Amino acid sequence: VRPLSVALGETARISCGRQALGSRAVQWYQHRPGQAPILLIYNNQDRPSGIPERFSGTPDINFGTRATLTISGVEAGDEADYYCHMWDSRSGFSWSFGGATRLTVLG
Amino acid sequence: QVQLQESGPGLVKPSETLSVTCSVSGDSMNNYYWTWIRQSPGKGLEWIGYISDRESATYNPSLNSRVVISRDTSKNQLSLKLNSVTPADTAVYYCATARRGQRIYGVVSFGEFFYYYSMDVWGKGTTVTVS
Amino acid sequence: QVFYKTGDIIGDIRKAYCNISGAQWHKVLGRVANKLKEHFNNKTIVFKP
Numbered sequence: 001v002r003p004l005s006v007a008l009g010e011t012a013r014i015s016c017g018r019q020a021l022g023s024r025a026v027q028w029y030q031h032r033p034g035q036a037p038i039l040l041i042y043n044n045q046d047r048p049s050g051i052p053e054r055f056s057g058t059p060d061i062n063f064g065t066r067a068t069l070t071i072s073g074v075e076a077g078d079e080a081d082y083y084c085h086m087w088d089s090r091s092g093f094s095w096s097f098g099g100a101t102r103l104t105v106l107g
Numbered sequence: 108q109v110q111l112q113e114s115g116p117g118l119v120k121p122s123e124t125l126s127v128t129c130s131v132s133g134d135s136m137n138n139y140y141w142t143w144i145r146q147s148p149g150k151g152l153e154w155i156g157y158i159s160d161r162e163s164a165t166y167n168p169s170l171n172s173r174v175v176i177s178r179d180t181s182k183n184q185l186s187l188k189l190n191s192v193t194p195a196d197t198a199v200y201y202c203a204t205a206r207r208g209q210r211i212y213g214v215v216s217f218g219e220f221f222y223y224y225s226m227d228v229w230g231k232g233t234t235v236t237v238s
Numbered sequence: 239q240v241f242y243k244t245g246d247i248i249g250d251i252r253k254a255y256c257n258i259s260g261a262q263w264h265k266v267l268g269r270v271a272n273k274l275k276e277h278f279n280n281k282t283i284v285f286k287p
């Protein structure tokens with residue numbers, strides 16, 4: 001698993017390693033090792049209750065754009081292994097849970 | 108609300124049948140599809156196989172129905188059952204609710220649409236180690 | 239001498255199609271059926287592919 005992060009006060013704009021081919025719809029989760037995790041943003045525009053405005057929202061129009069994940073208000077929870085749960089038309093089912101990315105915070 | 112609690116044996120003899128059940132409350136067969144999460148301490152994330160609401164069994168295509176899934180709905184102890192187990196497929200059996208939503212990009216009659224799969228609730232899971 | 243071949247598509251794969259009016263086609267077909275009935279000794283007109 002490849003780490004990618006940045007020091008505090010700067011947004012770690014991790015972009016999904018997968019490339020969007022065709023129509024896209026991504027799912028975003030706040031993971032926890034060995035326990036039950038939750039979801040943060042499961043669509044290009046969905047902002048469920050309890051989710052602040054810290055997340056950037058890119059509408060899925062004019063195919064060719066990239067799905068990038070940026071976060072703020074960093075805490076202990078976000079260091080867990082993120083999973084970019086993506087679905088695209090041509091590639092079909094994604095049996096893997098996407099590119100497993102982890103956030104490393106030190107200071 | 109959805110509550111999770113497993114009742115797995117915790118120990119399995121090699122090449123023997125398993126029955127890992129999960130207790131769920133507040134819902135029935137039709138509302139939630141039932142997938143299962145594969146996980147282990149310091150291991151990857153996968154779907155080895157899972158059951159549909161209509162008792163249809165869907166598996167990892169590389170797995171090709173190595174295990175057979177049956178369950179019980181009256182007890183709400185929906186079961187993922189493993190046949191001919193191995194340390195390769197040793198994983199904690201999260202009981203996961205599955206819901207489907209669809210993104211339509213083209214004419215529906217032609218078949219141009221796909222489901223964007225939502226993952227809301229994760230099971231607690233049980234740990235089984237092969238002897 | 240250059241030969242232009244078909245390249246791979248980008249984006250979502252889609253099928254070609256042709257949209258024809260909902261009721262105007264049936265209206266015109268009914269009128270054509272009436273005229274054919276006039277010219278064909280008042281028989282029932284059946285279309286087949």
Ligand SMILES: *[C@@H]1O[C@H](CO)[C@@H](O[C@@H]2O[C@H](CO)[C@@H](O[C@@H]3O[C@H](CO)[C@@H](O[C@@H]4O[C@H](CO)[C@@H](O)[C@H](O)[C@H]4NC(C)=O)[C@H](O)[C@H]3NC(C)=O)[C@H](O)[C@H]2NC(C)=O)[C@H](O)[C@H]1NC(C)=O
Nearest residue numbers: 044045059060061209210211212213214215216255256257
């Ligand atoms: C010939 O007639 C057929 C119908 O008989 C017609 O097919 C219809 O074509 C339109 C456009 O090509 C399709 O409209 C699509 O509708 C979906 C949802 O309704 C949209 O999906 C959303 O897209 C937005 C951004 O684009 C996204 O944010 C959102 O998440 C998506 N999902 C939802 C739930 O909103 C598509 O974007 C939209 N397509 C376009 C190009 O905008 C219809 O789905 C087709 N089918 C039907 C039954 O209407 C066809 O266009 C006609 N051809 C001509 C040349 O007129």
Ligand SMILES: *[C@@H]1O[C@H](CO)[C@@H](O[C@@H]2O[C@H](CO)[C@@H](O)[C@H](O)[C@H]2NC(C)=O)[C@H](O)[C@H]1NC(C)=O
Nearest residue numbers: 019021090091243244245246247248249250251
């Ligand atoms: C038709 O087949 C050829 C070869 O099987 C494909 O060419 C490959 O294209 C991918 C990327 O598009 C490259 O990574 C491979 O190295 C190519 N292979 C070779 C042997 O050159 C071609 O893409 C296929 N066409 C379509 C539309 O899928």
Ligand SMILES: *[C@@H]1O[C@H](CO)[C@@H](O)[C@H](O)[C@H]1NC(C)=O
Nearest residue numbers: 256257258259260261262263
């Ligand atoms: C075809 O295009 C014309 C003009 O763009 C439009 O008025 C008509 O409704 C279209 N046909 C159908 C079946 O929608």
Ligand SMILES: *[C@@H]1O[C@H](CO)[C@@H](O)[C@H](O)[C@H]1NC(C)=O
Nearest residue numbers: 272273275276277279280281
């Ligand atoms: C058959 O139909 C035509 C047109 O509708 C009409 O003119 C003709 O009189 C009909 N035949 C008879 C025997 O009435």
